[PDB]
Amino acid sequence: RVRTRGKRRIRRXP
RNA sequence: GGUGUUGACUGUUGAAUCUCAUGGCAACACC
Numbered sequence A: 001r002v003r004t005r006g007k008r009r010i011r012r013x014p
Numbered sequence B: 001g002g003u004g005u006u007g008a009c010u011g012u013u014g015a016a017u018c019u020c021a022u023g024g025c026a027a028c029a030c031c
Helices: none
Strands: A002-005 A008-011
Touching: none
Parallel strands: none
Antiparallel strands: A002 A008
């Protein structure tokens, strides 16, 4: 999954 | 309040990565 924080791309596993 | 680190969930696609979309707080450290 790809999470997004404060308009920031976060890559977390699937 | 600013900076850094960590992380769950919906759709489509395709096929171990990458890009796009959803939600929106929490924890720890430093100044």
